[PDB]
Amino acid sequence: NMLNPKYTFDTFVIGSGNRFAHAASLAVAEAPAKAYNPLFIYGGVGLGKTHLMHAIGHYVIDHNPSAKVVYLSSEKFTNEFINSIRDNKAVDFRNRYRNVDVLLIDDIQFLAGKEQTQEEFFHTFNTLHEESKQIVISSDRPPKEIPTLEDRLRSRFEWGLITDITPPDLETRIAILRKKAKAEGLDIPNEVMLYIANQIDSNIRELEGALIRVVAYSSLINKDINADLAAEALKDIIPKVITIKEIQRVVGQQFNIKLEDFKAKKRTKSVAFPRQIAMYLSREMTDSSLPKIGEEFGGRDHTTVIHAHEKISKLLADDEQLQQHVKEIKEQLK
Amino acid sequence: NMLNPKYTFDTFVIGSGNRFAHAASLAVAEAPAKAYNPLFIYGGVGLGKTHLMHAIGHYVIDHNPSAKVVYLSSEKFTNEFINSIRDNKAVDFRNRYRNVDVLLIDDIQFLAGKEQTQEEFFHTFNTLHEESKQIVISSDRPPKEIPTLEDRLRSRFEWGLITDITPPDLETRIAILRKKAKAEGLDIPNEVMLYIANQIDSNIRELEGALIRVVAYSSLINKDINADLAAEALKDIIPKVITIKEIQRVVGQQFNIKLEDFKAKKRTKSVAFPRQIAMYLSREMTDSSLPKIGEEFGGRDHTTVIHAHEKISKLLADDEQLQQHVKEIKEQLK
Amino acid sequence: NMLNPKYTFDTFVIGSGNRFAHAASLAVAEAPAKAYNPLFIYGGVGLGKTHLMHAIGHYVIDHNPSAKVVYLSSEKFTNEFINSIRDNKAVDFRNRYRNVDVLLIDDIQFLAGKEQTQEEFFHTFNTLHEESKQIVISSDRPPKEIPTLEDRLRSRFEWGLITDITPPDLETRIAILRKKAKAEGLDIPNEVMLYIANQIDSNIRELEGALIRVVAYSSLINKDINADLAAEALKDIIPKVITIKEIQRVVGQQFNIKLEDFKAKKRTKSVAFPRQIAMYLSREMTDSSLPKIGEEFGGRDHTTVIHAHEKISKLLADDEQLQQHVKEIKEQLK
Ligand SMILES: Nc1ncnc2c1ncn2[C@@H]1O[C@H](COP(=O)(O)OP(=O)(O)OP(=O)(O)O)[C@@H](O)[C@H]1O
Ligand SMILES: Nc1ncnc2c1ncn2[C@@H]1O[C@H](COP(=O)(O)OP(=O)(O)OP(=O)(O)O)[C@@H](O)[C@H]1O
Ligand SMILES: Nc1ncnc2c1ncn2[C@@H]1O[C@H](COP(=O)(O)OP(=O)(O)OP(=O)(O)O)[C@@H](O)[C@H]1O
Ligand SMILES: [Mg+2]
Ligand SMILES: [Mg+2]
Ligand SMILES: [Mg+2]
């Protein structure tokens, strides 16, 4: 029906970051409206929530064919709700959504900032929970930190079980890629697999994207996939952690002060100016503590750093030539 | 209809800079919504991304007349979306664009800075991907480079195939120019073809401008096209790499300091000043390493260059006569 | 409408400097949107660019009453665009300026420095060329040297034919004068036309103004126009080539020295200083080459010329009444 066939409990990879959410979803599928009537899922994007609840819907339909499992996104919920209001189809909207055996909702964050749709979902939740029906909600934030949410909805969300998804680690990244490769029907070396899994890790969508790009590049070049092939295909795609020494060398390449001049005790303006501009940049951009930064940068007290960067802010609040200088600094440092 | 009849697969010259993009585009045209749904071509200017998307549309419409194919630019998308919002026809906008079999969207970079429109296109993308429809996206720069793009949209862009287009080679430029001439229905000598293609490597949109200028000049002057006539026509149409030797000769033509004076070990202000002004000029307008430029400039240490160009920066941050002097220098060095 | 009855192809006098532009414009007029779609014409001031654009519009409207030709300036474009986006009526601005069969946009260089107006014109150009609508662009400088123009908009400017207008020569100046006089309906002796065309060669506009002044003064004096009356009428309206000999004579006059001792080998200050000032003036005023001026200076070496020029420049960089004397000398030479 309206469920992707690729998303299923059997095609889902279990890892440390999704074991709890997977187990809760499977328990809900095995015991609908009995174990966890409100089940709330939150996590990052590209982390497996839609896959998980498509798997729930598939499980429920397969084990029970009479069930009316409905899955949708909060965007479509609001669109249908408002169009029903505008076309006097409110009774039909209520009929279609209050009587489903299992309900599955994407990205309920979309409801934030919408008052009447939130009220209508509140009443739908109430009716479904009263009828001992099953409600499953996904989000990217826990219900505590969803803005513009009524306390009744916030308390309903926390009523049941709240599960979190975290970014996958290396073993499950390789396992996910292996599962995708085996489903597609391609043979690829472990070294290529590990190279991709190590080089790209922010979410999993980009993992599949990198894999399909490298296999397509190999197909075009008409050679089998190797580690060098993976490296050459995945070149325009490859975060740079900035260190205190890295920002020091950035400033000592742009304004190219010699390395030991910052540590010197010279009070002249020519020597001083790069010291305080780099001090302000490091203070605003790095997470290192103020005494620590003073320690590496000449072992200076925090008072000098404070005064220097404060006067730097004062001079950059009115003067624009150094403003374009500093925006270039922050453009070529990254 | 909305597709340029000239832009098609037959009129596209395959090279080493468009082979990967053309392969992905033709595979997508052969198997819409089955090979790589979110296809993402990006590249420079005048390179053929619009030609490629028009070719995809032509192929899929010819091989499947019933298929609903919509090509539009992201600017047109924003215009129509905002007009739908203001005219109270948003539902009609959703029906128009969410039900398309193949959606070709041009220059997605325009969505940078438009958060509501990015959300709308995010929802449209999700619908078109859930319904198993094809989405082809064009851009100037990779999705990780575009500013003010939500991580959801960036990850969905990077989910599918990503291809890039590079400027043509010289043989590719000659082949493109031959195809354009034979399409126009005229014969141009290979000497003229090589002359124009060797003169211009910017983009095909100016390659064809050069060819049309040559043909127009020949038609006016009532003489046959040859290399000399092409040179006559392209006098005012036709980048000069700036190197350290030519920078030194520019400064030795403006401030006319003799060649061996820079290499001299003198410490007088009159001798020294041209040395450091030229050194700062090169340092701000060269890609060569500081030790290399220092060795070239009399085999000097990098610290002396550092101090000299830094005092140059101080004297240019407050003095204006040398400011117009240096702007003249940079104007006439290029 | 917005076109000029006095600006048409019949009133245009074809010459060496506008034959190419006239032929390209006539081709565009005969076959709108099909021969040279992005036509770009640039030149000086008072040369015939707006005349040619109005002639193109006149021809198209005359041969095609169902043609929506719109002539406008860049200033009117930016005014209307900003007013529309301030009134929140941008949809009507777009509806007006993307449905024009021919767009005759003038003095496009005005768009320099207005980023969003440049973007709106960029989208307008894309929409108009994507639908096979003629585009004619006029400027005072070639598209390459229009500042703050993006590569995209410049490349669209360079896509088609680019023409240029050169200041007219004597025969076509006299032809323009004869045409203007015959259109006005007065008989003027050919000697008067030759006199005016000889003693005013700047553009059409001052030529037309000189003719108008001659006619008005002669009408006031109720005397038939002749060479002497034209001379008296143009007494108050009416550059010289600078000569090294003249410069030397002038400088020697101010600084109390004769003529024959310029090439003398005496190293006395009272003669060297005026000679250095004269050679500095020749260097910074004339295009004469350094070997040539050295030959005129009794075979002095280029190194000595360099040293004297640098010394004079540095000495003048610290004082102002030598600059005053130099300004007085330049005013005398003018
Ligand atoms: N074990 C796994 N954990 C997470 N994702 C997985 C796993 N195995 C496969 N995937 C893939 O991860 C991808 C992430 O897409 P998914 O639809 O789950 O995103 P999401 O974060 O839930 O977002 P949304 O709710 O907006 O759809 C899917 O294409 C899915 O096939
Ligand atoms: N490989 C090619 N063979 C033939 N013509 C080509 C090729 N690549 C580009 N062109 C031509 O270049 C011209 C301008 O390029 P085009 O508009 O197609 O690309 P683009 O600038 O990358 O696209 P977009 O405007 O969508 O960013 C077109 O007329 C097209 O025919
Ligand atoms: N070849 C020509 N023959 C006749 N008149 C000419 C010719 N060239 C220029 N002129 C005169 O130029 C006058 C005005 O100049 P025009 O506006 O055409 O030029 P422009 O200064 O380049 O234009 P713009 O208004 O775009 O800055 C017209 O009245 C026309 O008579
Ligand atoms: Mg999804
Ligand atoms: Mg594009
Ligand atoms: Mg003009």
Numbering used by the authors:
A (entry chain E), B (entry chain D), C (entry chain C): 109 to 346, 351 to 446
Quote the original article.
To understand the molecular basis for specific DnaA strand separation activity, we reconstituted the BUS complex in the presence of ATP using DnaA104–446 and a tailed DNA scaffold containing a dsDNA region (DnaA-box#6 and DnaA-box#7) and a ssDNA region (DnaA-trios). Nucleoprotein complexes were crosslinked with glutaraldehyde and isolated using size exclusion chromatography before being subjected to single particle cryo-electron microscopy analysis to obtain a 3D structure of the BUS complex. Hence, the two regions of the overall map were independently determined by local refinement with a mask around the respective regions to obtain their structural information. These maps were then merged to reveal the BUS complex, composed of the spiral region at an average resolution of 3.2 Å, DNA protrusion at a resolution of 5.0 Å and the central region at 5.4 Å. The cryo-EM structure shows that DnaA assembles into a continuous oligomer that engages both dsDNA and ssDNA. DnaA1 and DnaA2 use domain IV to interact with the two available double-stranded DnaA-box motifs, engaging with DnaA-box#7 and DnaA-box#6 respectively. Thus, G18 and A17 are captured within a dinucleotide binding pocket created by the ISMs of adjacent DnaA protomers (DnaA1 and DnaA2). DnaA-trio#2 is engaged by DnaA2 and DnaA3, which generates an analogous nucleotide binding pocket. This pattern continues with each additional DnaA protein, resulting in a total of six DnaA-trios engaging with seven DnaA protomers to generate the domain III lattice. Inspection of the DnaA-trio interactions revealed that the two captured bases are stabilized by several hydrogen bond interactions.
DnaA is a multifunctional enzyme composed of four distinct domains that act in concert during DNA replication initiation. Domain IV contains a helix-turn-helix dsDNA binding motif that specifically recognizes a 9 base pair DnaA-box (consensus 5′-TTATCCACA-3′). Domain III also contains residues that contact the phosphodiester backbone of ssDNA, along with an unidentified ssDNA binding motif that specifically recognizes the trinucleotide DnaA-trio (consensus 3′-GAT-5′).
